[PDB]
Structures are given as structure tokens and as C-alpha cells.
């Protein structure tokens, strides 16, 4: 029993953090096969930051200009693209230790596990959940921009995140790796106000799904509130559109508590826990998916 | 900016992780060098369990009733002795992968990863903070027992936990990698409870002074508390004994901010926030260490 925020293991991530320079400025990569992922903003100055004009920069730049670096391994840029907001790096040396791996893209209220990393080195790992905003809560410093957001499906690294953009203070977003933004955010310094975000309604009650099996149903009332109506009220008081997931069904079945019966719950939640805590908290917990409480029951 | 509960990465720790079973009994050890630790509770039938005679026990097993299975790759055991309540099982094979790794114990307070893993095979970590309780809040179900817990120092693992016991729900200890378990617990099937915990006070400080410098200060006042006023207020209510680390005093000078002027906040804080949120939070969250939220600084 207990619920945690887990990340996923961090060794088919690690051989593949590469360090990424360009004049004065060093962030990280990703080296998959033959290929180096890096935010395209490694070939800014400080004086074109504004409003870049990245198109007008890489006439400016070369190969050689690229210094791609596994640990203290030099990698040979053979030629470099433009794909959106990322650039990828074709090097003459193949990563031996390349995963299976995918190229994905979450959708708010989704986990994964960030693996931060300064200069080309991992420093470690954590979890966190894509908001309503695009955005999400992370711990990034100077050197973070590159560090990569995966998640581990079987045996495959669904790649889904490359650290890009500190909007405001503990606000992170970046790109998929098809270069394109999380939201409709941009790689400009310019001033960047946050997408409206609001409260994970299928993760909260994933929550209090684990509660119950958690020995923990004191919010269980003879209440019900069904997807339709709750979705109508959620509009105006701060909660996300809920869908009937397929392992809600699963954990429905296993505590004898239907999703109507939760939904109702949330409602009257929603006007105070009135000092009872659910799993050490007062709040509404959305950071976890309902197969992310599932892995853990 | 952004602080978060961090976990080290797990690239050093995966290749250690072994399967051990006895009988209809399998649970995890830890593979380095030649030697294979699990718990000593591997060999307990369900009918020797609520006193169970250990000594008794080890007369009627042979290292050929140990079956040690790293992946798919079998290990023979050639012999095994018991020091304290851990099994360490001499096998033929040197483990390639041992990391530079020490045996340490953590203290209450202070934080450690958990590589949580079921029939030898790591699933996933987590951030954990060892209680005044000497129990950490984790996350593990059946097979669970012999999954470790580490903290990286440079470049050596320092391993301090091994999985052994769910107290209550959610309430998991173990022991040190002497055998030694944390508190008073023992491993036996009968009723045990919690040593007295606390809040974390010095981790608290350390959640303020990062509170300071991602721009939320509205704690901070005139009010000052000497660390000895504030230790004896504490014994009353629900607080640790405060120390002053090295960390502390770093975290001092870059904010301008006392430990005094904190230990004053403290115990404002102790009567209510009043709504307002420090890092998203109204209550005294003391899950990280000076050192942990220095790293993020
Ligand atoms: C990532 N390494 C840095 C750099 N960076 C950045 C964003 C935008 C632009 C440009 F030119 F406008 F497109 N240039 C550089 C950025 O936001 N960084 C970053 C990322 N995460 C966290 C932090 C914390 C502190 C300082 C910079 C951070
Ligand atoms: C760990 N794999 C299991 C087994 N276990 C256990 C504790 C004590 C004893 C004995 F014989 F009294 F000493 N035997 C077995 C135990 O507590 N386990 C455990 C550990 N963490 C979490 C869970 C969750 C559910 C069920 C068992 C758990």
C-alpha cells in the first residue's frame, strides 16, 4: 500500500545525453542512432533574442561551428536541420546504446519522468504531469534546456519532452520531437502568460479510487453524479472535462464504488475537505493518472 | 526555478538488482561482487512467522535451496550466513557491474531514492524521507521486499535501505546493509507501532529559504527566535530539534535571511497560513533536505 509520484528507471535514457555547443552557449542533447535532438536556440546571441530570425542565423553557421560531446567523447557534426523549434544534428558515429524508442506527444494531465541534466550530464530524475496550460512544474537551472521527458511503454522510451523555456517562476514548457511547442508558446524572449489551467479531473479521481484501497472512503456518500452533469459544472468551478477511462472501469470493479459516486464526491470536496485528510492531503491531488494509481495497487 | 523531490538516477543500482527465492517464497536482493543480500525472512514458512526462530531456521537450508536469478541469468550460491536480520549469499560469479558503492544510515530527515523492483526486475523510483518514525512513506506491494535504497556521494553509491516490512498503510521500513533494522521494528507478523514522529525542521527552514529565493517571502518578519528558544518550543509542539548545517548558513547568506528570522516564521506559521500558499502549499512540507534544495538553487 501507498501512493507515490515514480518515475520511470533512468538507464536507457542516460547513454544518450550528449552536451551541445555553440560559441558561448552549451546545453543538452539527445543522440539517438545517428542523430543529436538540441533546442534550436543554442544558436542565439544575446542580442538577437527578441524576436529571432532563426532562418537568417543558420546562413551563419557550419557543422564545425557544433561541438557534440558524450561525456568526454567529441561527436563529428556531418550536417544539421531545422525541424520546428528543435534541431537535429546528423554525426558520423551511431549510439551503440541506442533504446527501442518512439517519438510521442502528451496531452494534459499525462505523466512522465524528466531526466535533468547540466552540461551533457544527467544530475537525476523526476516526475511530473502536463497541465492545462502546456506547461509543467519542473526544477530546471542555467545549463537544463535539452533535458529530455520520457516515458517507458514495455520495453520502449516513448520520447515525449525536450526541456526548451522557463516562462515564469516554476513554469517549464518545450517542444515534442517533432519540434513543435507545447501550447501555443514560443522560443523568443518576449513575455510569456500561461494557458488557462485548471484542476485533473480523471487524475483526482484516480486519487480517491487509491484512497479507498488505501483504506480511506469517508467522502463515499449515497450521492451521484453522472459524466454528463459534472462536465457542465467543471465548466465554472476550476475542473477539467472528465472521460471514462478504461482503467477507471478497472477501478471501479475493484473497490465496488462507480465513477458517478466519485464525481459526486468532488462537488461536495470542491466547498472543503472541512479538516479530513485523504492520503496526508487537503488538496486536490491530480498529479497521478488512474494507471499511474493502478501500477501501484 | 521550481523545486521538486528529485531521485538520483538508477543506472548504477539497476545492474545490481538479483531475483531470490525460497520454496514458494521470491522477493530482491542486491548483487555486489560476489555477494547476493535479502532479507532473512525469504525463509519463513507461514506457520513459523508470528516468532519465528531464525537460527532454527538456517539448519534446514542448504545454498542449493537459494536460487539467485540476475535477468534470465542463473547464480550459484555457495555459501550464506546472517548477519542480523539480512541474508548475504557468497555466489560464484563477480558482479561486472558493482558500482564504487558504500554501506551507510541515514538519519530522520534526511532523503534517499528508492529503486523499487518485484522478481529482480526494477519498476520505477521514488524520492523518500526517512521519519522521525524511522519508517519512510513509500509505495510497495507484494514482491517488494528487498528493494533498496540509495543516495549517490560523487561518483559512489551509498546504500542505506533495504525493504523489508509494511507496518500499517502506507508505513514501510527496513534495515541498514549491516542488518540492522531502523527503530525498534522487528521482523515477526505481529502488531507494530510507530515511534513518535515530527515535522522536519530543518527541512522546513530549507523549503523556506527556497520559498525566498523562487520570490515568495510574505512569511518573513521582524520576529526573531534563537535556535535554542525555537528547540524548546518544539518538544511541545510536534517540531524536531533544530541544528544548524553548513547548508543553512550558505542558504543564509544567499538570501540575507536569519535562521533566526525562519524559526520566528515557524512558529506563525504553526497557527495558520491563512490561505496563502508558500510554492503551492499550506502546510509544513519537510520532505527535503538544506542540501536537496540547494542543488536546485
Ligand atoms: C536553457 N538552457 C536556458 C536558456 N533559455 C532560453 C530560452 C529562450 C531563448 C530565446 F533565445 F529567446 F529563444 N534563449 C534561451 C531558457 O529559458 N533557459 C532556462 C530553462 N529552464 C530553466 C531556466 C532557469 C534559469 C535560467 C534559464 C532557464
Ligand atoms: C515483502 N516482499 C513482503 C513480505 N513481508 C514480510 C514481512 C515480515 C515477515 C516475517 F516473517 F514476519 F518476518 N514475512 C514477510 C512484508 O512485509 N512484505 C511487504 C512489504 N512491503 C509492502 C507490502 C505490501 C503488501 C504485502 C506485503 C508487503
Chains 1, 2 share one sequence.
Not at 542523430?35 to 533574442?49: E, G, Q
Not at 480517491?208 to 484501497?213: H, Q
Not at 463515499?220 to 476550476?238: H, I, M, R, T, Y
Request: aromatic share 12%; proline share 3%.
Amino acid at each position: 500500500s501507498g501512493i507515490v509520484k515514480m518515475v520511470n528507471p533512468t538507464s536507457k535514457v542516460e547513454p544518450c545525453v550528449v552536451s551541445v555547443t555553440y560559441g558561448n552557449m552549451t546545453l543538452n542533447g539527445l543522440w539517438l542512432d545517428d542523430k543529436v535532438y538540441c533546442p534550436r536556440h543554442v544558436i542565439c546571441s544575446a542580442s538577437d533574442m527578441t524576436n529571432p530570425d532563426y532562418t537568417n542565423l543558420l546562413c551563419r553557421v557550419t557543422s564545425s561551428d557544433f561541438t557534440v560531446l558524450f561525456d568526454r567523447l567529441s561527436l563529428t557534426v556531418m550536417s544539421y536541420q531545422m525541424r520546428g523549434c528543435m534541431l537535429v544534428l546528423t554525426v558520423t558515429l551511431q549510439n551503440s546504446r541506442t533504446p527501442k524508442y518512439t517519438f510521442g506527444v502528451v496531452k494534459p494531465g499525462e505523466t512522465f519522468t524528466v531526466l535533468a541534466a547540466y552540461n551533457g550530464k544527467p544530475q537525476g530524475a523526476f516526475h511530473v504531469t502536463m497541465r492545462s496550460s502546456y506547461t509543467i512544474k519542473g526544477s530546471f537551472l542555467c545549463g537544463s534546456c535539452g533535458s529530455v521527458g520520457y516515458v517507458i511503454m514495455g520495453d520502449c522510451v516513448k520520447f515525449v519532452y525536450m526541456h526548451q523555456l522557463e516562462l515564469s517562476t516554476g513554469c517549464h514548457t518545450g517542444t515534442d520531437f517533432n519540434g513543435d511547442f507545447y501550447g501555443p508558446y514560443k522560443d523568443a524572449q518576449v513575455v510569456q502568460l500561461l494557458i488557462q489551467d485548471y484542476i485533473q479531473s480523471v487524475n483526482f479521481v484516480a486519487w480517491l479510487y487509491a484512497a479507498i484501497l488505501n483504506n480511506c472512503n469517508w467522502f463515499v456518500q449515497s450521492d451521484k453524479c453522472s459524466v454528463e452533469d459534472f462536465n457542465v459544472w467543471a465548466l465554472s468551478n476550476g475542473f477539467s472535462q472528465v472521460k471514462s477511462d478504461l482503467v477507471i472501469d478497472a477501478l471501479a470493479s475493484m473497490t465496488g464504488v462507480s465513477l458517478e459516486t466519485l464525481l459526486a464526491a468532488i462537488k461536495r470536496l470542491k466547498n472543503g475537505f472541512q479538516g479530513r485528510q485523504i492520503m496526508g492531503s487537503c488538496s486536490f491531488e491530480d498529479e497521478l493518472t488512474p494507471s499511474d494509481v493502478y501500477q501501484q495497487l
